[PDB]
Structure formats: C-alpha cells, structure tokens
Design a protein around this nucleic acid. Structure first.
Lengths: 154, 67, 48, 98, 79, 157, 138, 41
RNA sequence: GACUCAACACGGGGAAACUCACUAGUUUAAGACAUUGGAUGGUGAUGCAUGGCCGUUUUUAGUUCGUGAAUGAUUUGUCUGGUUAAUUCCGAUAACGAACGAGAUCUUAACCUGCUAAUUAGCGGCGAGUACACUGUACUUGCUGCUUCUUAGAGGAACAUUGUGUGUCUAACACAAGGAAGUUUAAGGCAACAACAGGUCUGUGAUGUCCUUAGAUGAACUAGGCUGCACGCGUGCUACACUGAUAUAUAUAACGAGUAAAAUAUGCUUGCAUACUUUUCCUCCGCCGAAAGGCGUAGGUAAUCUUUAUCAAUAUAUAUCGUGAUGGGGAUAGAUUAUUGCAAUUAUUAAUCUUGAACGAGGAAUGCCUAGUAAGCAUGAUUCAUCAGAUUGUGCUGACUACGUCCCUGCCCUUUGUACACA
C-alpha cells in the first residue's frame, strides 16, 4: 500500500531520495535498539509545546523527534533553534480568544542538539553558523538510507 | 457593449477622406486607422478600427447612409 | 512637569498639536486630520 | 552608480544619458539593472468627524532604483551627472576594476 | 521667580542684530536652540514683548515663527 | 545615516514646508520659480534647515479683502482668464454673502472637465479661505490648461 | 543539450530544464513520488502517459518549486513539464513526433500547456469578506 | 449511551455492526483476526 | 458628540500618569502693550453664525445652455419604439446644435516582444570532493558565456476577431473556433446638478458672535472615569464534535515591518555634577529557565540580516478516542512565575497547575452572496512602553445552484387624481 509504481529513474544516493515518514520511525526504532541517546528522564514530565497543552502520549516522542531534526539538518545544512521551534510550532487555543500559532518549547530541542553534538553526528562552526552534519555522519546516513531503501525495495 | 457618439462620429469622419486605401480587411483597416487618425490611446484607436471594419462589412450591400 | 520619553506624551502632531489620531508609519508623526489634505503635496498619491 | 527617484521618466532620461555617454567614451559598462519596484503605502479614513459611513482611502509611492557600473574617472562621471541631472533624482557612485 | 538676567537680553539682542532673521520655535519646554546656547523660555518672554512694542513682525506658522527684523527697530534696539 | 524611505518622507515634509512658505510670502507677485527679498528668504530657509491658476485665485481673494463688489469683478476676472487663454474656468464662493444665509454660486463656462484622471492632470484647482467680519469665505477656482491632447479630441485632415 | 522552460500556475512558480540523460526527473532534491498526495501523483503522471516513458528514457528533466499552495505547485509543475517536453521535442529529439504529441496534449486537455489566469483579487472595503460587508441592524 | 464491550468483510464499521462492538475494540479484533482508515486488503 | 438605512468595535475612542474635555484638590504667572488702564489663551456655547472636509440621496443616470418653436408659471429639445452600463446609441421627430455627467482616462491578475537588461536574483560551465551508479545524482568551495525563468522600462495583444443565427437587416445581442484574455476580461479611484438647515467651531493660531482669565474655562502635578450593573439593543470571538477532540511528521504563500537615550569611572556623600561608545528596531545564534522570560555577540537605514531555496493555518499520513454534556466545550475562581511600564490594586500581558457553566445547532424576525467570489482557515499592518476578540491588506483550502424575474422591498420613467408644497 505504501509502495507505488514509479515511472521515472530514481537515484537513492542519500536520504533525500527516501520518504521521511518511514525514515523517522525506522531510525527511532534503530535508536531505541542501539541506545545511542538517553531518554532522558527529565523531559517526560513536560508538554512538547505551550500550545499543545497535553502530553505526547507515545513514550517514544524524543527519539521520534531526534530523527526528524536529523532529516531537517540534511534538508538544509544550517540549523538553529528558532527554525526548529518554528517548524515544530503548533496552533494554540486561547480559550475564548481565537486560535493562534505559537512555537514549541525550545529546551527539548536544545537538549536534542547537545546530545547529537555529543554523538558527533553534528558539528558547530563559525562559518555556516547553523548546525550541519559532519562527513562521517553524512556517509553513515547515506549508507543507512541505502539500507532502508533496499529493505523496503526488495 | 454598444457604442458611443464620440467614436461613432470619429468613424464617420474618416472613410470620407481616404476610403480608397481602406479595404474589407479588418487588419489592414486597423493598420490604416492609426496612420490617419490622432487618437492618443490604444483602446479607442482599435475600437474605432473595429467600428470602421463594421461599417465596411455593411458597405456595398445596399445604401449605407453616408460617405 | 513630569515628561516621559514614551507614549502620547512623548510626541504629538506637528501641525495640529493634538494628542489624538497620530500615525507613526514611516515616521510621518502627523495627525490624520491634516495629513488627509497634505498627502497630495507630500507625495501620497491615491491609486486605489 | 545607483539612482533613486519617485518619477519614472526622470530615471528614464537619466539612464538614457549614461548609456549614450558611456558609448561615447567607449568604456566597459554593465547593462541597465532593472531593480524590483518598492512601494510604500498607507491607509487612512475620510470624514474627520465620527458621523457617516466609514470610508477609507489608500496611497501608493513606488520608488524607482536602478544600478549601473563603469570604469571611468570619478571626477568626469560626477561632472557629467551633475551637468545632466535634476534635483529630484538622487544618485550615488561606486566604481569597478574588471 | 524666573528672573531673567540682563546679560541674557543683551546677548539675544546682539545675536538677532548680527543675524537679522530669527527662528525661535513655538515650543517653550525645549532646553536649547540649535544656534543659541541659551534657554528658550526667555527668548519668548522677550520676543513677544518686542513684537507687542511694534518693532519686529512675525508671519507665524505652525510651531515656527520666522520673525523678521524691521528697519525702524534697529536704532531703538541698539542701546 | 537614515533609511531611504525616511529620507523620502523627510524631503517631502521639507517641500511641504516650502510650498506653504510660498503661499504665505508670495503675495506681492505671482510665481517666478523657487530657489534651491531673496536675501532674507535664503537666510531664513538656511537657518531653519541647518494662466497661473494659483495667482488668479490669490487675485480673486485680494479682490474681496479690498472690500469690492464681488459680482462686478468676478466677470472681469473671467475675462482676464479667457484672455490668458484658458478653455474655461469655474469660481465658487461660499459663506455668509452679505446675509445670515449661507449660499454658493458657481461660474461655469467652456469645457470644465470635472472628473477622471485626465481631469486631475489638466485641471489646476486652488482653494483659499478669506476672513470676514462675521466668519470666513471659501473660494475655489479651477482652470484647465489648454490641451498633450485630450483623449476625447478626434480630428482627421 | 539543454533547454529550459518556465511554469506559472496559480500563485506557485516552477522552473524546468530538459537535458539528455537516462530518465532522471527530480523535483528539487526529492523524487516526484515523494510529494505525499497520490492524488497529485496521478496529476503528474497524466502528462507522462500522454507522451511516453520510452521517449522519456533518454531525457532528464530537473524541476524546482518555490512558493504557493499544494494545488498551485502541482499545476505549475504539470504545465512546466508540458512546456519543457514540447520545447525539447521542437529542438532536439524529433519534429515529426512533436505534432502528434501536441495534438494528443490538446485533444486531452488545454490546461496542460497553459494554466489559468485566476488569482486572488484585492480584498474590498465594507467588511471581512471580499465581496461582502458587515451585517447591519436597523 | 454506549453499551458494547469486547467479550464475545473486515471493514471496521461492518465488524462493529456485526458483533455489536465499538470501533476501537472492533479494530483490535480485526488485528487479532488478521494476525486512520486505509485501503481495503 | 452622534439615534432607521444615513449613530450603537463610530468620533481612527485596544482610556495605570497626561490622553482627561469631569471630579477631590494643589500650585504657577506663563497678565504681552502704555499701582492702574489694558489683551492673548480657552476641549466653554453656538455646525440653527460659518469655511473646508465627509456621509447620504448616489454607482444612478441624470443635469444644463445657445437659438428656434408653444398672457404666465412653464414646455420642447431631454422622445412612441429597439438595445445597453448609461439621455448608450439607432430611429421617429418643432426642434437644431452644444456642455457636464456616463463614457473615456490609469494600476493589479493576466500572454508576448527568446525585446531592453542585470545588483542584493537566476540559467549554466569547470576546480576539489562527501556515497552510490557506470562504458550523473543529494550535499559542500571559487570564478566567469548568458537573462525565459527573479525582476522590470517600453511596446504589442482584445476590436464581437472570424464564421453559424436573432434583430426594423439598423443600433445590438446569441453559438462555435482561435486566443491567457469574448460579461468593457474582472477589482479599483476620480462622482455631474441640486439638496440635507445631515456630522464636525473637541483638527487646526480656519472661524464671527456670546462667555472666562488669578479662586483660570491657560498650563503643570497628585488619586480616580469611561473597565461599576435589574436590564434591552447591535457589532464581533468560542463552541455545541467523529468530514471530529488529542499526539507526531512531511509540502507549503503574499502584502508587510524593521537602528535627544544606556552603561562605565571620578569627586562629594546607593544619590548629584562631570567625560567617554552607543543602549534607545527587527533580530540570527550559543547558552540559563518547560515556558514566560534572561545574558553576549553575526547581520541589516535594508531583493544583502530577521527571511523568504521560505515566517501561519486550513490540511496531510499514521496512532488514541469511537458520538456517551464524553475525554467534547471552556464561562468560573484560586495559586504563581516573568516581562511592559517610576507606577498593572480595577490580579495590564503572560508560561504552569487546579477549578468544569451554558451548548444536542437555535421562536418571531433579520443580515450576506454568483467564481479565486461564499465559507472556513489563518496571517501582515494600524494605534502600541504593554494589551486585538477592533479595523484595514495578503495568502491557502476553490463550493451546491441560477445565467432570470418584478412577487416583496427600494428606486427610476410615463400617464393620472389631488383640497399636499416644512410637500
């Protein structure tokens, strides 16, 4: 069902040629299996964003978000915290006042970025101030994406 | 849509002067009308062009009241 | 006096010297009442 | 060398001057840069009193700016522009090397 | 209080004498004038008095005066 | 070092001062250009910085402040305008008019286009308020310059 | 060699370029299958069955999208790729097949080659609605 | 007022109508039998 | 102040000081000129003294003149009829001929001129690759054939164009085709004549007249007031759910808007005086804090930095719920952390937690609407130190239905009757 006949030649040379939706879940599962990062304990008592006003209700949201930020890191190689907050921003019902868009909480994204830097998948540099992937992480994610592509292909 | 008296009388004034170069063809008649007239804007220029074409298509099938 | 560098007390309309209906777009700093008629000579030509 | 104005015919004549002067002086010049027009608008209400139907009108000021570059003496270029300029237009200068 | 020193009138009279055209600005709470290192409250209490004495004349505008120096006031203002 | 938008509005404000300066001071004569008598004008301006429809309106204003009969001399002003060469003119005066009832009379003649962008471009219109013992009088004068050519003008030789 | 065409449908805008290759048609950095709406995947497939995968096997068509809502860029890319294939047939591959290609395109739909002029009009006065003013009470 | 429980065509609506169950428990039974809306198998 | 349309989210009126016009008050001379004489000023009155501006008749087609013609007011022209956007034209015609109005005029959407061109934009080409293909690709670094693509100067294109029809075969209208454009292609602003005793002298040092000025009706400051409530009337926001409530993820716009004040030190004894940069906008980032908020810096007076190879939402794909006033729904009050502002109490605003009303789609009545429009969804800007539920632009999601009629309503024309004419 999730696979469709494609009438043009693909490339599959990196993550940009694979669907995001399955990539996030597959790499969250891989992260859970490998125990690459902590949960951590502190983050699971707070809602993801002010406008959400409710718990994520999945218990794997941290790992589901980490791979999404990795995807965004590759999609354009300059990542800050404002861009992440705006992307994961959500509508907020102010009660009797009209619905208004508000950003997500940035501390969880800051913690995710720090953990990714600790893992070494991402590096910081003065030039290209936004977060970008290292060459090691780039080729590793290329091979991982090709593995996922072949796994869902045959 | 209809037509206004100003451009109606504009279309009456010409033809009487140089109908010899004016023919049945709408395109060449339109090319003629800017050559002969002095209207400063394009819309009514080509409006009167179409109107002179409309008078030519009734020319030479009976009396035409004028010219 | 007790002047303040903020609010309607900080600045007023230049021509009518009133505290009401003063616009701050593009630092016009003038009241709409007289801006309506000074608009044309200022350059504010209405198109729509 | 950039220009800014409010009336397009002024910038048109000013530009028509500089291309012909450049061709006369046979010096390398960039082509006429046609910048996107930047428009300034404000909406206000008629009827200074509070009575009657609320009616509002808008204004529009599009500002014309164009760029150009020349390899020529900063003195001769400013002299020719001052000779063939009008106070309405405001012009700034920058030179190139290659 | 607001007592105005005599040197203040002397300096402002000499300034307007040597200039010939004075823009004094209708505002009175502004501490200083761009071309006058003097408090601007006194240059009104003097200028309105002088105008009411019918020696200098003001075309007036919004927040601007443009007082002009007449020919007949020079002899009286000299001393 | 200010933004170009603020520079444009500032120069617009300065010329807004300049045109009303012209209205205030240019009363002993018509319009003979602007400077970018003259001694005091330039001194005041620099110290503060660091056929003629407008003239005809001013003349009609000075008319009434001399205390002259309006009806006898408005026709003379009309003759002056068509001798200056206008296609037509319109003078409207509103106020007390020698009574306690507000009235208004329009003096129409010639083409006198009244609406449209071409009307805005060609018609030179001026307005002025003139004081009077029991109020003020509003005077509006519109004169169309002789016709580039108007769109409605069609002719072939 | 290289031909370039443009695309404007609704607010969105797109750029197409047809070059020799092996059938590499890419939208930005992704594939056309990764759009997400299969409903619009059908729309992009519509021109392809009207021309031929075999004839596309030797041509690479790069596509960029910048702006507009989902329907806007799907229609923009549809018409842009239509223009690209038409021009590159007119230039490089062959002209005898081009007349039949354009005949099929027009006899199927005129929206493929040229888009619509419909766009949002300036919001009017009176009220929240463009063609409606506020409710009034007598 | 709901009354269905879980104690005892595979589309959830048909299964719910057949077994007098809610949609969630019907989906659970569907998973149990096979082993939001998507294309029919 | 304003009281049917033509008042009641209006006075650009989102009021902690002023704003402030009021109140309890306190001061000041800031009364020019020739003790005293003596004015300016005034949000004090008079829009029924006015000017200007505007809102209505009124987005409609109407208004006027020269000459002619028919005790006088007056009539004709300015119309039986056909058409329409309209006294727009055709046509008959004691009228002929004019002027205004309509039209016309000009921007946006919209195609072309492979025109005219490139900064801060793009198409490329190759200089080195990061991994895969195989006889370029997603991502990185630098320069240079060029301008359809990003943009904009000018011009062209649409004129019932061409054919099948209706029509006095006249003015026009209908179908088909080309075409981006066939209702002027659609939206805009200018709005004639005349009138309202419509609103405004609280916008003006525009304004007469009447009134006040030392116990000010001038100005400044202190606490308040429009935010209080048995109630009625609008304008609006939130819902009354399963095409929906909750949680993640992908594809997303355009109009926008953006630079006389901080801190440091010295003397005197945190405060006063003195000198040094700019702190006095949006902000990116990296960090502290769930957040609110805070610290230090990139960038930009701006197609250059926010940000724009992209800033919102309606969606979207998958999970939980599976229509049970329920978990929907958020009226209600309590506890707080932070900023804005010298000052937030009448808890401004605000992150968090607790609290848990009506609401099963709404009587009589009433409003709005014909294609990117309804509606929904957002979002920019306005006043703003802080506060949109207000107003004014922008975009996304692109609908059901006529393609007409005068039945109501409201206007317009003709005839007609009037004892009405402030109609």
């Amino acid at each position: 069902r999730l696979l469709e006949p494609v009438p043009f030649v693909k490339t599959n040379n990196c993550i940009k040629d694979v669907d995001a939706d399955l990539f996030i879940r597959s790499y969250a599962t891989h992260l859970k299996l490998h125990n690459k990062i902590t949960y951590p304990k502190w983050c699971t008592f707070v809602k993801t964003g002010k406008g959400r006003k409710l718990a994520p209700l999945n218990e794997d949201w941290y790992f589901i978000r980490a791979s999404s930020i990795l995807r965004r890191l590759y999609l354009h190689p300059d990542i800050g915290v404002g861009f992440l907050r705006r992307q994961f921003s959500s509508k907020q019902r102010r009660g009797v006042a009209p619905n208004h868009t508000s950003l997500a909480s940035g501390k969880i994204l800051r913690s995710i970025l720090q953990q990714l830097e600790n893992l070494g998948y991402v590096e910081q540099n003065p030039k290209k101030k936004g977060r970008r992937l290292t060459t090691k992480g780039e080729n590793a994610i290329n091979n991982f994406a090709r593995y996922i592509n072949k796994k869902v292909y045959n | 849509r209809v037509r206004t008296k100003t451009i109606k009388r504009a279309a009456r004034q010409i033809v009487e002067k140089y109908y010899a170069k004016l023919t049945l063809d709408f395109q060449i008649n339109k090319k003629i009308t800017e050559e002969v007239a002095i209207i400063p804007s394009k819309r009514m220029k080509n409006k009167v062009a179409g109107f002179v074409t409309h008078l030519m298509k009734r020319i030479q099938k009976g009396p035409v009241r004028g010219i | 006096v007790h002047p303040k560098k903020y609010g309607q007390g900080s600045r007023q309309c230049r021509v009518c010297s009133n505290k009401h209906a003063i616009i701050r777009k593009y630092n016009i700093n003038i009241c709409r009442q007289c801006f309506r008629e000074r608009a044309d000579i200022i350059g504010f030509k209405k198109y729509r | 060398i950039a220009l800014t104005s409010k009336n397009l015919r002024a910038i048109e004549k000013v530009c028509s001057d500089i291309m012909k002067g450049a061709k006369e002086k046979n010096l390398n010049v960039s082509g006429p840069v046609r910048l996107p027009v930047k428009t300034l608008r404000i909406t206000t209400r008629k009827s200074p009193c509070g009575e009657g139907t609320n009616t509002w009108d808008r204004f529009e000021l599009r500002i014309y700016k164009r760029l150009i570059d020349l390899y020529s003496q900063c003195e001769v270029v400013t002299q020719m522009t001052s000779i063939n300029i009008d106070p309405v237009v405001e012009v700034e200068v920058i030179i190139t090397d290659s | 209080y607001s007592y105005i020193p005599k040197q203040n009138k002397k300096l402002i009279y000499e300034y307007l004498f040597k200039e010939g055209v004075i823009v004094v600005e209708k505002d009175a709470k502004i501490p200083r004038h761009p071309h006058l290192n003097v408090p601007n409250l006194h240059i009104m209490m003097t200028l309105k008095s002088l105008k009411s004495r019918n020696y200098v004349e003001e075309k007036y505008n919004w927040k601007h005066q443009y007082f002009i120096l007449n020919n007949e006031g020079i002899e009286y203002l000299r001393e | 070092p200010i933004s170009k938008k603020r520079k444009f509005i500032n120069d617009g404000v300065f010329q807004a001062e300049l045109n009303e300066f012209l209205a205030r001071i240019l009363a002993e004569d018509g319009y003979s250009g602007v400077e970018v008598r003259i001694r005091e004008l330039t001194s005041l301006v620099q110290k503060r910085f660091f056929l003629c429809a407008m003239a005809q309106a001013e003349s009609l204003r000075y008319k009434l402040l001399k205390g002259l009969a309006v009806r006898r001399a408005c026709y003379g002003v009309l003759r002056h305008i068509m001798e200056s060469g206008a296609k037509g003119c319109e003078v409207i005066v509103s106020g007390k008019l020698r009574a306690q009832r507000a009235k208004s009379m329009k003096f129409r003649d010639g083409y006198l286009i009244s609406t449209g962008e071409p009307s805005k471009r060609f018609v030179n219109t001026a307005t002025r308020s003139a004081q009077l013992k029991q109020g003020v009088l509003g005077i509006k004068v519109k004169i169309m310059l002789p016709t580039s050519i108007l769109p409605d003008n069609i002719s072939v030789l | 060699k290289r031909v370039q065409t443009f695309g404007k449908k609704k607010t969105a805008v797109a750029v197409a370029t047809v070059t020799n290759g092996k059938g590499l048609i890419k939208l930005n950095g992704k594939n056309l299958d990764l759009v997400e709406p299969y409903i619009l995947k059908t729309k992009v497939y519509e021109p392809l069955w009207l021309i031929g995968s075999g004839k596309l096997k030797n041509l690479d068509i790069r596509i960029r999208v910048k702006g507009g809502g989902q329907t806007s860029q799907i229609y923009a890319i549809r018409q842009a790729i239509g223009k690209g294939i038409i021009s590159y047939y007119q230039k490089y591959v062959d002209e005898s097949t081009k007349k039949e290609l354009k005949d099929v395109l027009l006899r199927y739909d005129r929206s493929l080659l040229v888009g619509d002029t419909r766009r949002c009009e300036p919001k009017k006065f009176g009220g929240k609605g463009a063609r409606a003013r506020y409710q009034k009470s007598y | 007022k709901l009354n269905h429980a879980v104690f005892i065509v595979i589309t959830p609506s048909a299964i719910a109508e057949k077994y007098k169950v809610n949609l969630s428990v019907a989906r659970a039974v569907i998973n149990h039998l096979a082993d939001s809306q998507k294309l029919y198998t």
